[PDB]
Amino acid sequence: KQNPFVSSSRRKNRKRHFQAPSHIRRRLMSAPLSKELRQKYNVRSMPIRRDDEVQVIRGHFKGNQVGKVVQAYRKKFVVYVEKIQRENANGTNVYVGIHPSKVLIVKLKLDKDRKAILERRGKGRLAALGK
Amino acid sequence: GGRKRPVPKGCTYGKPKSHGVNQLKPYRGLQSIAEERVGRRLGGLRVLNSYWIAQDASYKYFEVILIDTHHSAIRRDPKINWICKHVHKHRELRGLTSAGKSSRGIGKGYRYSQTIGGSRRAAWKRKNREHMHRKR
Amino acid sequence: QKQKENLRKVFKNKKYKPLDLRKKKTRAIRKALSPRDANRKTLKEIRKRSVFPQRKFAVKA
Amino acid sequence: TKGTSSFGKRHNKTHTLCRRCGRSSYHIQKSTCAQCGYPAAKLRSYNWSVKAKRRKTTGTGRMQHLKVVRRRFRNGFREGTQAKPKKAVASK
Amino acid sequence: VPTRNRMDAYNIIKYPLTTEAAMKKIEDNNTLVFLTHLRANKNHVRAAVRKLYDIKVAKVNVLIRPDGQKKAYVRLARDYDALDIANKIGII
Amino acid sequence: AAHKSFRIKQKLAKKLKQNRSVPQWVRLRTGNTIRYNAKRRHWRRTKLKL
Amino acid sequence: RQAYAVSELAGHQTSAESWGTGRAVARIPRVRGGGTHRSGQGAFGNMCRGGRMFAPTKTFRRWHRKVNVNQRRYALVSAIAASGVPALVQSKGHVIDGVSEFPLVVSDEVQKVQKTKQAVIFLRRLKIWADIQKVYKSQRFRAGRGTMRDRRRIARRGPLVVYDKDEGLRKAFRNIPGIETINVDKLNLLKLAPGGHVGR
RNA sequence: AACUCUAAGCGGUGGAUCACUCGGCUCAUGGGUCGAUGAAGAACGCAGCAAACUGUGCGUCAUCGUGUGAACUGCAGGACACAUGAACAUCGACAUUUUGAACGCAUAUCGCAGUCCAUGCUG
RNA sequence: UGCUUGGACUACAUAUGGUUGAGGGUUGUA
RNA sequence: UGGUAUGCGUAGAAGUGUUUGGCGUAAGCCUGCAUGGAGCUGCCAUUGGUACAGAUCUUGGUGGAUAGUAGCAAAUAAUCGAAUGAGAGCCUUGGAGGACUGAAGUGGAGAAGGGUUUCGUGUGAACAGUGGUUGAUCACGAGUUAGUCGGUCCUAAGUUCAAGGCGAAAGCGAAAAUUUUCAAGUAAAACAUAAUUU
RNA sequence: ACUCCAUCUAAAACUAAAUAUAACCAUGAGACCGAUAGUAAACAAGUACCGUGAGGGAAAGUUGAAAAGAACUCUGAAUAG
RNA sequence: UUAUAUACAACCUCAACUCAUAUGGGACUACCCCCUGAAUUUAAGCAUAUUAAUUAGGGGAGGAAAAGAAACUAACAAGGAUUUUCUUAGUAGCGGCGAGCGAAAAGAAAACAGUUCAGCACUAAGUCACUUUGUCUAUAUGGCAAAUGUGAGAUGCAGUGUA
């Protein structure tokens, strides 16, 4: 961080991510796009939107359980996905907390909003390659 | 005159140097005392100056110069525009009035070397500072 | 809001609008000399400036 | 016998709830607050009582109006409306 | 402004009490008992009851709850039977 | 007292509301420090006094 | 060195005056009033809970020596002289077992290097490889407490490349771990002899 | 035997020690932004479930406008109004109680007037 | 009018403008 | 803390218990074994809030006294005994029965005070220096309706303070109380409007 | 005191910058402390609590990767085992 | 007018307005401008002294404050507002000349910036606040224009111009 506005300080950075207002929480709760989707759109990553199909690259599942996000629970910093649940002693199937920084987005919801953001990501993709 | 110490008639609790009551005198002139009193009642007018007309025994007669900063004549007219600035709010208590400036004792030079360098509080502070340069 | 704008358009063209239409900025700022009445210069200062305005020159080798 | 017995005849409230601060410190007989100088212009905020100022200060309350003044300064106290650069038509 | 009238017929009557003892007083004594605003001067209560629910009010007796709320016991004219009116307000 | 001034009655009335044991479903919150209502003023344990 | 001081008001908040003996409890100052269980409880001592330490750290604590003009320069020149002499350089570490020459001079074309990849290609052939590899592998999480202070740890100061003219040398060089660039004008003693250990 | 002494193993008791920390502390840097246009502070009532913290004022855990674009979440009423918008920020439009400089006069009384405009009832 | 409810007003010091005023202060017309 | 051992490390760090083995005159060190879970150390230089047994030290914890020794003893003080429950001398309670205060009350009301303590229901741990199913406990609900009783109103002792002033101001350990008519005023008109009234 | 010289022009008024900053707002660092420490307060902290009042004013951080916070059966009124 | 004989027009001075229009109070209080103002302590006791023109108290402002174009500093080959820093200086000097206290000038630097009434013959008050209406147009206590309408002002204001 070369510019004077700028916290490297450990305590300050921890304020930011833990106490994150929900819009910063979306950024944090982004997941990288699948290798497929990277060819199509030329987009690294997108911030999880409810119908997104997901494969968990880590723990216990490490490849597959091709399922759709129920809700992004931003205050828990956790994403719950349909079909991915842990057996409780009381037989109650409760969702496994899956961070989106473990995940590939396999399928992207298209809205006019969602496309515009993919397009922003498309346009900046040209620039630093140029540099 | 003499600003007789508000003492309980109990003797002033300490050292004999502090035992004078009635020979103890204002470090502020009677010009300024006239101004400060007017200024609290008339907080909306800003006081430039005070001059004397007459004096017998118990009282001293002053005419005090008051300005309306909220009157657009006095906003209006360029020479006196600067008095409308919020810096001049109650000059009298800060002795930016002529009466107050003299009591605070700010003359260039030597007869006032202490206190001209710093206004009267300020001079003390400079002198009694250990200026510690980093690279000692 | 429809009352508020109704009041604004009536008090528009009219000096000394009701206290709540007056830009509640801060107390100090309101009383702090309108821009016209700060720029005001004595007739003499206009002469001084008129002939001699600080002109953008240079020094040296 | 005025020992515990001195406690036993204590029934007459010397102080009632402050109109200024609710700190229950207003002297009935003198009609004056200890601490908060009860309706005599000044709150008695002593610089010897550093802790007293600490209680009485901004930040112990919600600071309702003055907090909004801070953000408006950065806005340079503008009356108007920003509105919307692009469409954005509300129809069903 | 001018600032709109801050005690409408609505605001005056917040709720009907509906407590077990209150319901008995509808049955027996032909009273409809309401939670009211602490600003409601009895004569507010009469006016509001008359206007909202069509009922001729005979007398109103007012209590303050230890829950910092008012109870208004509204006596109805013998032309109007309570229990029908309570169930017009929809509450058994 | 025994017939309490209206100002007093309002302050005491608010105090009665405080004396309630915390809803037990609030205790189950993520980063919930609240085990109990702990400011429960029981009148012969903690007055209001003075 | 950035000034740390203990709060000057810390342990002086407490109004505590000390109970004279006969009180059957020790001399030290004790917190007045009632029922908080801070009262009264142990105040003001360096030997007390919540009480201020003897010698409380003060911001007037001397950071800097002004070092004699000739003296630091002497150290600097001595450092440059050590930068040749292969035994000294081996002594500090720096895996230089198969290096082209000491004192290692390379073409001025080195300065022009816009890109990090291009830089590494040069350096390795020029015989940096083992010493640059000495860096990156060694990065390790700080043992202290020092980890919280942003003092994440020490990793290997591999090579000091010196340039007369920055034609894009610095930006390319900045990235690569433990590799530092200096100008001939500035020639830092810290960079030439890190830890006072001669033989960069 | 039991007990006591001495040592050791195991279990208690107790919270030292270690390692962590959305906090504290101190130095540096940018800015000047309370108030009779009714402050700071206090009191009071407010969440579907809250009693506080926190937020807010009677439009009460918040409203316009604006930004983003789908949560909140303990349980849920809700979730819908995700494409005109959640929710959080922005917050420039409004609201902003009873007070407090505190302003009709008072205040072990939320007590008691006067005045203008206005409403219902009776006439 | 009676009876009843809501809103807005009614502190003090003080400048200026407004008009009413006032004093064997003092001037003049009669 | 700078440097370094291309140090160690979740395949178990640090910490710590330890009749592991050993080193040093010692300060102290290493290692084993068990526990552990997330980070750590040696060496050379560099700085200190740097090593504890004490200070009638501080703060927290814990013993012997003492699973019980003081005691839990004033107002005699129960008791038969039905019901219930996990348990019941009291406390839960009837019936019964011994008595108590002995209407100058341990009664029946209120102020001053208390602040939900009142009351129903549920009723366990903690509390009732004992038990305790019961309670002023703990949990859950309800309840304090007035033209005529008080507050209100009124004045008292006395006070808050607008004054001419005085004070460093605030304020006056002040009743200052002076302030055009500071005054109360008419269901009243003619010429200072016309009576009175500080 | 006398005799001179030099030097300004009081008893009036306006005026940036360098200069201060333990508060406030917006920020960045530390050979800072690491829960008897550090601010009084890492936490419903100027809180709970005491005192008529002024004031005095704490103790108290940590399950785990995930609550997966021990279903079920049994003994026990039950807490527990 | 003025003996109580009325009426009108002025000036001065003081009242009455819930008058038209405005303003002050209070807080915050790190920094700062003033007023006001100790003692512990040191002197091995103790009073002057010291602590100290400091704590406490109270009023008032700003982003800095205050200060500010010298009734200066000097004695020169003078320099040239103010502020601060470096220096002088632990010194000139003060002081039971005990304890202890003590600055400025020149010299160096940071940053720099200058000025104006009022008092002379403008000599057709050249000036100004307000109230209304034209216009303008902020969301104005605004500017333009008209009434040449009140009022201020020769008991004095414009304006050259400030040693």
Q: Residue A79 and residue A95: Cα distance in Å, rounded?
A: 9
DSSP SS3 for A107: strand
Q: Residue E21 and residue B124: Cα distance in Å, rounded?
A: 79
Separation of E3 CA and K77 C1' (Å): 65
* CA D35 to centroid of chain Cα atoms: 13
Residues 45-64 of D with CB under 7 A from strand H: 56-64
Minimal CA–CA distance to G172: which of G81, G110, G80? G110
- Contact (Cβ atoms closer than 8 angstroms) between residue E82 and residue E65: no
Helices (H), D1-92: 5-8, 50-56, 64-74
Cβ of residue D68 lies below 7 Å from strand H: yes
Residue A87: in which H helix or E strand, if any? strand A85-87
Query: Footprint of strand I, using CB within 7 A?
Result: B 41-45, 68, 71; E 1-3, 5-7, 39, 41, 43-44, 47
Which residues contact residue D5 at a Cβ distance below 8 angstroms, ignoring those fewer than 6 apart? Answer: none
DSSP SS3 for A84: coil
Separation of B69 CA and L131 C1' (Å): 22
Long-range contacts from D87-91, C-beta under 8 angstroms, 24+ separation: none
Strands G160-163 vs G180-183: parallel, antiparallel or unpaired: parallel
Long-range contacts from D33-37, C-beta under 8 angstroms, 24+ separation: none
Strands E70-76 vs E31-36: parallel, antiparallel or unpaired: antiparallel
Structure tokens belonging to residue E16: 């009907």
Structure tokens belonging to residue F15: 């105090």
Which residues contact residue F45 at a Cβ distance below 8 angstroms, ignoring those fewer than 6 apart? Answer: none
Kindly list the residues from chain A whose CB atom is less than 8 angstroms away from the CB atom of residue G148.
10-11
B131/G contact by beta carbon, under 8 A: no
Residue D21 annotated as lining a ligand binding site: yes
Torsion of CA G137, G138, G144, G150, to 10 degrees: -70
Nucleotide nearest the Cα atom of F4 (by C1')? J115
- Contact (Cβ atoms closer than 8 angstroms) between residue A47 and residue A26: yes
Separation of C26 CA and L127 C1' (Å): 34
* CA G186 to centroid of chain Cα atoms: 19
Chain J positions with any atom < 7 A from a protein CB: 1-9, 39-41, 44-45, 48-49, 55-60, 110-117, 136-147, 150, 159-161, 166-171, 173
Q: Residue A36 and residue A44: Cα distance in Å, rounded?
A: 11
Cβ of residue B29 lies below 7 Å from strand L: no
Chain H positions with any atom < 7 A from a protein CB: 19-27, 32-37, 39-46, 49-52, 54-59, 64-75, 82-96, 99-103, 107-111, 120
Q: Residue A3 and residue B25: Cα distance in Å, rounded?
A: 60
Residue D87: in which H helix or E strand, if any? none
Which residues contact residue E63 at a Cβ distance below 8 angstroms, ignoring those fewer than 6 apart? Answer: E70, E71, E72, E73
Q: Residue C21 and residue G154: Cα distance in Å, rounded?
A: 63
Separation of G151 CA and J1 C1' (Å): 10
Mutation target among B46, B67, B80, B86 for the C interface, most CBs of C within 10 A: B86
Q: Residue B1 and residue B57: Cα distance in Å, rounded?
A: 10
Strands B59-68 vs B45-56: parallel, antiparallel or unpaired: antiparallel
Residue keyed to tokens 């010897």: D48
Handedness of CA B4, B6, B11, B16 (dihedral sign): negative
Q: Which amino acid does the sequence have at E78?
A: R
Residue keyed to tokens 């833990």: A18
Say whether the peptide bond before residue G38 is cis (omega within 30 degrees of 0).
no
First-to-final CA distance of chain E: 43
* CA A97 to centroid of chain Cα atoms: 13
Minimal CA–CA distance to E53: which of E30, E7, E85? E85
**DSSP designation for A116:** H
Q: Residue F32 and residue A18: Cα distance in Å, rounded?
A: 15
Residue E46: in which H helix or E strand, if any? helix E43-53
E89/F contact by beta carbon, under 8 A: no
Separation of G50 CA and K32 C1' (Å): 18
Q: Residue G98 and residue B48: Cα distance in Å, rounded?
A: 87
DSSP SS3 for B64: strand
Q: Residue B39 and residue B37: Cα distance in Å, rounded?
A: 5
Residue B81 has its nearest CB partner, among C28, C31, C40, at C40
Query: CA neighbours within 13 Å on the CB side: how many for G67?
Result: 9
- Contact (Cβ atoms closer than 8 angstroms) between residue G122 and residue G173: no
Helices (H), G58-166: 69-83, 86-91, 116-126, 129-136
Kindly list the residues from chain G whose CB atom is less than 8 angstroms away from the CB atom of residue A8.
150
Give the resolution value in Å. Answer: 6.0
DSSP SS3 for E61: strand
Structure tokens belonging to residue A2: 């070369």
Residues 28-87 of A with CB under 7 A from strand H: 47-50, 71-76
Which residues contact residue C57 at a Cβ distance below 8 angstroms, ignoring those fewer than 6 apart? Answer: none
The C-alpha angle with vertex G75 and arms to G73 and G80, in degrees rounded to 5, equals 95
Minimal CA–CA distance to E60: which of E51, E50, E69? E50
Cα distances from E30 to residues B128, E43, E91, G78, in angstroms, run 87, 19, 15, 109
Strands D26-27 vs D15-16: parallel, antiparallel or unpaired: antiparallel
* CA A82 to centroid of chain Cα atoms: 16
Residue A104: in which H helix or E strand, if any? strand A103-107
Minimal CA–CA distance to G16: which of G58, G55, G49? G49
Helices (H), A29-130: 35-41, 112-130
Q: Is C51 exposed, middle or buried (0-12, 13-18, 19+ CB in 10 A)?
A: exposed
Q: Is E15 exposed, middle or buried (0-12, 13-18, 19+ CB in 10 A)?
A: exposed
| E strand spans, chain G | 17-18, 29-30, 160-163, 180-183
Ramachandran region, residue E51 (left: φ > 0; alpha: ψ -120 to 50; beta: rest): alpha
Q: Residue E69 and residue E72: Cα distance in Å, rounded?
A: 10
Q: Residue A123 and residue A115: Cα distance in Å, rounded?
A: 12
Q: Residue G162 and residue E27: Cα distance in Å, rounded?
A: 102
Kindly list the residues from chain C whose CB atom is less than 8 angstroms away from the CB atom of residue D77.
23, 25-26, 29
* CA A29 to centroid of chain Cα atoms: 4
Chain L positions with any atom < 7 A from a protein CB: 21-30, 32-40, 47-50, 53-63, 65-68, 70-74, 81-87, 102-105, 116-117, 127-130, 136-143, 158-161
Kindly list the residues from chain G whose CB atom is less than 8 angstroms away from the CB atom of residue B135.
64-66
Q: Residue G180 and residue G157: Cα distance in Å, rounded?
A: 8
| E strand spans, B12-118 | 45-56, 59-68
**DSSP designation for A100:** G
Minimal CA–CA distance to A29: which of A69, A83, A82, A84? A69
Q: Is G192 exposed, middle or buried (0-12, 13-18, 19+ CB in 10 A)?
A: buried
Q: Which amino acid does the sequence have at G79?
A: A
Size of interface B-C (CB pairs under 8 A): 22
E67/F contact by beta carbon, under 8 A: yes
Residue keyed to tokens 């917190």: G31
Q: Is D33 exposed, middle or buried (0-12, 13-18, 19+ CB in 10 A)?
A: buried
Q: C9-28 burial, b for 16+ CB within 10 Å, e for fewer?
A: eeeeeeeeeeeeeeeebeee
Handedness of CA B88, B94, B98, B104 (dihedral sign): negative
Strands A45-47 vs A93-95: parallel, antiparallel or unpaired: unpaired
Q: A20-48 burial, b for 16+ CB within 10 Å, e for fewer?
A: beeeebbebbbbbbbeebeeebebebbbb
The C-alpha angle with vertex G144 and arms to G139 and G146, in degrees rounded to 5, equals 75
Cα distances from G143 to residues E20, E77, G153, in angstroms, run 70, 87, 8
Q: Is G176 exposed, middle or buried (0-12, 13-18, 19+ CB in 10 A)?
A: buried
DSSP SS3 for B20: coil
Minimal CA–CA distance to A61: which of A77, A81, A45? A81
D75/C contact by beta carbon, under 8 A: no
DSSP SS3 for A53: strand
- Contact (Cβ atoms closer than 8 angstroms) between residue G94 and residue G134: yes
Residue keyed to tokens 């000091």: G160
Long-range contacts from D79-87, C-beta under 8 angstroms, 24+ separation: D79/C23
Residue C6: in which H helix or E strand, if any? helix C2-11
Helix, strand, coil shares, percent, chain E, to 5? 35, 25, 40
Mutation target among F7, F8, F10, F18 for the E interface, most CBs of E within 10 A: F10
The C-alpha angle with vertex G30 and arms to G28 and G36, in degrees rounded to 5, equals 150
Helices (H), G24-128: 69-83, 86-91, 116-126
D-proximal residues of C, 9-28, CB under 8 Å: 23, 25-26
Residue keyed to tokens 């990288």: A32
Q: Does G148 sit within 8 Å of A8, measured CB to CB?
A: no
G64/B contact by beta carbon, under 8 A: yes
- Which residues are registered as beta bridge partners of C17? none
**DSSP designation for G42:** B
Q: Which amino acid does the sequence have at A117?
A: I
